[PDB]
Design a protein around this ligand. Structure first.
Ligand SMILES: CC(=O)[C@H]1CC[C@H]2[C@@H]3CCC4=CC(=O)CC[C@]4(C)[C@H]3CC[C@]12C
Lengths: 62, 218, 221, 212, 220
């Protein structure tokens, strides 16, 4: 699915942007946007990836 | 292309020096994983050394590996460097650079491993002595006091291969190596067949052909 | 082909002498496996004697028999030898040679040979016919027999018509009395087959090297 | 000291189709180096189980082996007629290698009456000076049986029993009466009498020397 | 501190065509907060880098044959191989990632199983060339035995030696699966010439009694 791949690329880009951020609120907003994009893609795997990214970002940045 | 990591060749150092090992990644997007380092000591367990994140370059070390070790990156060339300062005799080990994932947290792609050996002994050639025989009799050659590894032992220029045992080398107290090569032959052929052991040590450019005879008890 | 182990050298030996048994192996690479001698007392459990390695460098033997036996092998003729000195009455037994392999323990066994240590003297067997009486011919099946009496030592082999008749043959264990053995062997055949067809019992005694063929004949009444 | 292997039970009386279990117990740890052998009456031992769980080539699937440490078990799920034998357990963990005592397996069946036949001494044995009167009792069960010799009605007797047959599981018995030629010729009537569980009256087989 | 992983057993002899089982036990709970249990199994062959076999307890990594299975929970985990082959020999070890930092187990080695066999013992004296240099090495060789456990002792005039002998062991043979061992005793020239009788004593499980191979200095 091309749409799924594009959504995955966008999710990874958002995760990369969040990883190099200093304000945890900005990272939370980016992760919320990524979760919304994953929900729009209708793929459980993308939701799982977003959930894991949230955990990793919250641990490392927070 | 095939996803792989390439590491530099083996390293031989003296105490007090500094070494630098490289790890080059090819076959994937270098900025979507993490680079972990693993150290394996002889006869011990694998030990996680630390990891470096590509996004920001900030490294993380365990407590035991702080101070003397350093991680660095060259993103344009897709390379990771490990730098060791103030070497000791306890740092002789094999180092792997491996790729770590962000979703399942495993190490799925491993490098070949770079061996680092630290010792103050200097290059020296081997000495070959005959373990002489005295319906099946065993004989051989003893290789003593050579540094560093490895040496190659052959019988009759490779003509004899059945029953030949070549034991792994062991480090002596003085810092040099030794080993033994043995072979079993029928007793009736001892006085007819000429047995020669050939020992080759490339770092010292030493090649020795030793003839083994039954001990002249007469 | 099929793995074959064939023993030889057994029989009667007077006490205090020496004994030499041989075992020939065929069907496999004789110079690659360990070789074992095992023995069994009559009516008892097995007992392990010893074994030897391919090049005769290491020999294992039971501690109680370490000083009495000597094992050797010859890969030129595919042969294994056992030698015993000063045998006693306690060594009367049956001996097997077995292969001891790398991945399977004791997979192939020989037939085994009988060793009897006694001071008696060899005596050839006496074979007698056993024909049914006139009143025993009223059944569809009729029994005949051969009686082997007064032989020494064991064993004797009794067959009927050179092994052609294998069904309906009972061979009872021998009884020992006054240093002589006695046994009887019976065969049951359809009444329409005898005396129309010839029935002959063959008795072989290797110890006395005596072979006797005795035809079953109706009683001369 | 030598490792002592104790095997139980010593005797087994089972009917066809049942399941049996034999236990071999060591005096000290022998890891998993135990082999189970089967020996039929009058033949060489045959390897059945090795390394305590593995099955040798050609062995029917109804034989299983298990255990570890100091106890091992050998199990037959469905006993057939041709499984009558003696079974041994052996360890080769440490020299010297010791065998167990062995379990002797026996088969039950329905009771059967014996077939009785009598044979007077042959002419050649009479010529030799002796006289052997033979009594054959074929195909009965169970083994317990009484044999009586009657010379002219009046009560040198050797008794031999065969091993249990592996096809129909019956026992056969040979009774031999040994006498001198003169003693045999001094009497006419000779009777073999069988008393067995299958009947309340003895089976009588009689002959007369004058008769032939 | 760091989670401690203990693996059972240290050496596992198995035969081709059968099943094998390996146990890994942690020092504490490996269940992560989010719900997943991160226990991984790796395999390493001689002379190569480790390769992932199983991830997250029971999942199977891409390319792994179907005969590998994993199970367990809490602090007890198990790996099972239904039908061992010649290519499955190596060192297996577990790892965790649920608590910083990841740790690795000690490793279980798989090897072929065969029957017991006693060693052949030989003894080699020192040559004259070495004696002219001031040192003397005496060698005791044990040939073609199984299993790996054997004990060697050096006796000089019936006095047990300690702290100057070194041993070396080969790998399992590729044709009949046996080992070989070499024990070297090093002496100075004066100490070598102070004594007469030298002996190597071997104790092995497959031998009913210890085997002594001895010689005398200067004799033949
Ligand atoms: C991407 C990568 O290399 C992985 C391999 C091991 C992983 C770590 C394992 C331990 C861990 C547990 C957490 O709950 C937070 C994230 C961390 C700290 C992980 C971060 C990502 C790592 C470093």
């Amino acid at each position: 699915d091309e749409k799924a791949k594009t959504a995955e690329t966008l999710i990874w880009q958002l995760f990369g942007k969040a990883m190099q951020q200093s304000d945890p609120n900005e990272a939370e907003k980016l992760l919320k946007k990524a979760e919304e994009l994953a929900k729009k893609a209708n793929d459980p795997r993308l939701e799982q990836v977003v959930r894991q990214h949230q955990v990793v970002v919250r641990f490392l940045v927070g | 292309g095939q996803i792989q990591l390439v590491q530099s060749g083996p390293e031989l150092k003296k105490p007090g020096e500094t070494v630098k090992i490289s790890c080059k990644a090819s076959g994937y997007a270098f900025t979507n994983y993490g680079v972990n380092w693993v150290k394996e000591a002889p006869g011990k367990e694998l030990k996680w050394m630390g990891w470096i994140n590509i996004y920001t370059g900030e490294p993380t070390y365990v407590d035991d590996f702080k101070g003397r070790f350093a991680f660095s990156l060259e993103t344009s060339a897709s390379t990771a460097y490990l730098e060791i300062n103030n070497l000791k005799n306890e740092d002789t080990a094999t180092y792997f650079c491996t790729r770590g994932d962000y979703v399942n947290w495993y190490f799925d792609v491993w490098g070949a491993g770079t061996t680092v050996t630290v010792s103050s002994a200097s290059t020296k050639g081997p000495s070959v002595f005959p373990l002489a025989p005295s319906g099946t009799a065993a004989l051989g050659c003893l290789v003593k006091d050579y540094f560093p590894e490895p040496v190659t032992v052959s019988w009759n220029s490779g003509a004899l291969t059945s029953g030949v045992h070549t034991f792994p080398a062991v480090l002596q107290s003085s810092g040099l190596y030794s080993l033994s090569s043995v072979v079993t032959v029928p007793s009736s052929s001892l006085g007819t067949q000429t047995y020669i052991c050939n020992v080759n040590h490339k770092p010292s450019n030493t090649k020795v052909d030793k003839k083994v005879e039954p001990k002249s008890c007469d | 082909g099929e793995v074959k182990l064939l023993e030889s050298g057994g029989g009667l030996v007077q006490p205090g002498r020496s004994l030499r048994l041989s075992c020939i192996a065929s069907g496999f690479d004789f110079s690659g496996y360990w070789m074992t001698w095992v023995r069994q007392a009559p009516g008892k459990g097995l007992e392990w004697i010893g074994d030897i390695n391919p090049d005769s460098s290491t020999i294992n033997s039971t501690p109680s028999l370490k000083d009495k036996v000597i094992i050797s092998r010859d890969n030129a003729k595919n042969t294994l030898f056992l030698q015993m000195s000063k045998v006693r009455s306690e060594d009367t037994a049956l001996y097997y040679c077995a292969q001891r392999g790398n991945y399977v323990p004791f997979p192939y066994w020989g037939q085994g040979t009988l060793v009897t240590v006694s001071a008696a003297k060899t005596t050839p067997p006496s074979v007698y016919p056993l024909a049914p009486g006139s009143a025993a011919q009223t059944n569809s099946m009729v029994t005949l027999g051969c009686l082997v009496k007064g032989y020494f030592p064991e064993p004797v082999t009794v067959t009927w018509n050179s092994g052609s008749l294998s069904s309906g043959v009972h061979t009872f264990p021998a009884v020992l009395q006054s240093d002589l053995y006695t046994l009887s062997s019976s065969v049951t055949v359809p009444s329409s087959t005898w005396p129309s067809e010839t029935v002959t019992c063959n008795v072989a005694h290797p110890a006395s090297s005596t072979k006797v063929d005795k035809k079953i004949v109706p009683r001369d009444c | 000291g030598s490792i002592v292997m104790t095997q139980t039970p010593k005797f087994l009386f089972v009917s066809a189709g049942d399941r049996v279990t034999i236990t071999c117990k060591a005096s000290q740890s022998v890891s998993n180096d135990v082999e189970w052998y089967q020996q039929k009456p009058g033949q060489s031992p045959k390897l059945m189980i090795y390394f305590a769980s593995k099955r040798y080539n050609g062995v029917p699937d109804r034989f299983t082996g298990s255990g570890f440490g100091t106890e091992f078990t050998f199990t037959i799920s469905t006993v057939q007629a041709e499984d009558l034998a003696v079974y041994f357990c052996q360890q080769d963990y440490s020299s010297p290698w010791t065998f167990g005592g062995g379990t002797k397996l026996e088969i039950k069946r329905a009771d059967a009456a014996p077939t009785v036949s009598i044979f007077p001494p042959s002419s050649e044995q009479l010529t030799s000076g002796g006289a052997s009167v033979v009594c054959f009792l074929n195909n009965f069960y169970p083994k317990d049986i009484n044999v009586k010799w009657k010379i002219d009605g009046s009560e040198g007797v050797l008794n031999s029993w065969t091993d249990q047959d592996s096809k129909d599981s019956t026992y056969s018995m040979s009774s031999t009466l040994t006498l001198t030629k003169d003693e045999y010729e001094r009497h006419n009537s000779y009777t073999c009498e069988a008393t067995h569980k299958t009947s309340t009256s003895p089976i009588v087989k009689s002959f007369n020397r004058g008769e032939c | 501190g760091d989670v401690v992983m203990t693996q059972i057993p240290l050496s596992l002899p198995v035969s081709l065509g059968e099943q094998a089982s390996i146990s890994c036990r942690s020092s504490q709970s490996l269940i992560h907060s989010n719900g997943n249990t991160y226990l991984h199994w790796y395999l390493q062959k001689p002379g190569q880098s480790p390769k992932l076999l199983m991830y997250k307890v029971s999942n199977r990594f891409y390319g792994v044959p179907d005969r590998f299975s994993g199970s367990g929970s809490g602090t007890d985990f198990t790996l099972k191989i239904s039908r061992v082959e010649a290519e499955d020999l190596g060192i297996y070890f577990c790892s965790q990632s649920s608590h910083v930092p990841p740790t690795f187990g000690g490793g279980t080695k798989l090897e072929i199983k065969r029957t017991v066999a006693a060693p052949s013992v030989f003894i080699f004296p020192p040559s004259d060339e070495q004696l002219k240099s001031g040192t003397a090495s005496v060698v005791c060789l044990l040939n073609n035995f199984y299993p790996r456990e054997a004990k060697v002792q050096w006796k000089v005039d019936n006095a047990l030696q300690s702290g100057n002998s070194q041993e070396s062991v080969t790998e399992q043979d590729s044709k009949d699966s046996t080992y070989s061992l070499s024990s070297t005793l090093t002496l100075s020239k004066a100490d070598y010439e102070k004594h007469k009788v030298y002996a190597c004593e071997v104790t092995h499980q497959g031998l009913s009694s210890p085997v002594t191979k001895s010689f005398n200095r200067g004799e033949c």
